[PDB]
Ligand binder design. Structure first.
Ligand SMILES: Cc1ncc(C[n+]2csc(CCOP(=O)(O)OP(=O)(O)O)c2C)c(N)n1
Ligand SMILES: [Mg+2]
Ligand SMILES: [Mg+2]
Length: 208
């Protein structure tokens, strides 16, 4: 037999500005693709998934994905699950349907009292940047509800490499975006804050 795993993705969000694309161009980045896609997130009425740092979505053209917290000191760690059967097992453990019998994620939604909590369309430009060695990716996202966020992404092999990669992408992010102390918010968090502010408040309360 054999075991297989992926690389580690390291990421940092930033607020783009009017000059972000021009900076990318002058740095020698190339625009690899432009794409538009719907994201739809799901949770229970009590926000069971989100309150425990679990994030379940169906992404147009990609299928189901679930993000779970992992056990970078100042920065978050996530395990991404895209196997439907592993998503469903994780959801059963957390939301406890002992009786529930497995199936595709879609089929188990009702049984788990999972409902759509947010849906929106993102228009994305994805750029690649080689410096002096593997190309960084820069995703520039525009959400149809009216919010723009960029993100710099690097891949690395071992967890030992994560701290240096983080510093690099933080520094690159700062040259591409508006000055800021903290990381720019995720599209979903801005959506929740503006359009589901009672839910946002629950999330705020939990984290402090
Ligand atoms: C302040 C804050 N930021 C981030 C998180 C974690 N989080 C919020 S929404 C989300 C899912 C959306 O992730 P995103 O990075 O926007 O996915 P993308 O659309 O870029 O693929 C996660 C993991 C949190 N709990 N609190
Ligand atoms: Mg990306
Ligand atoms: Mg990303």
């Amino acid at each position: 037999g054999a075991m297989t795993q992926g690389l580690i993705e390291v990421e940092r969000k930033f607020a783009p500005g009017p000059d972000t694309e021009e900076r990318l161009q002058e740095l020698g980045a190339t625009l690899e693709h432009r794409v538009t896609f719907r994201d739809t997130y799901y949770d229970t009425s009590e926000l069971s998934l989100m309150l425990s740092d679990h994030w379940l979505r169906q992404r147009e053209g990609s299928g189901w994905e679930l993000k779970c917290p992992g056990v970078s000191g100042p920065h978050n760690e996530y395990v991404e699950v895209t196997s439907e059967a592993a998503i469903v097992a994780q959801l059963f453990e957390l939301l406890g349907s002992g009786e529930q019998k497995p199936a595709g994620v879609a089929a188990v939604l009702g049984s788990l009292k999972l409902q759509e909590v947010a849906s929106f369309i993102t228009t994305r430009s994805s750029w690649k940047l080689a410096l002096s060695e593997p190309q960084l990716t820069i995703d520039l996202d525009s959400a149809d509800f009216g919010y723009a966020v960029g993100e710099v992404e690097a891949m690395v092999h071992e967890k030992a490499e994560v701290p240096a990669a983080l510093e690099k992408i933080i520094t690159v992010s700062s040259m591409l975006g508006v000055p800021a102390q903290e990381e720019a918010p995720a599209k979903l968090m801005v959506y929740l804050q503006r359009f589901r502010p009672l839910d946002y408040q629950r999330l705020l309360e939990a984290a402090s």
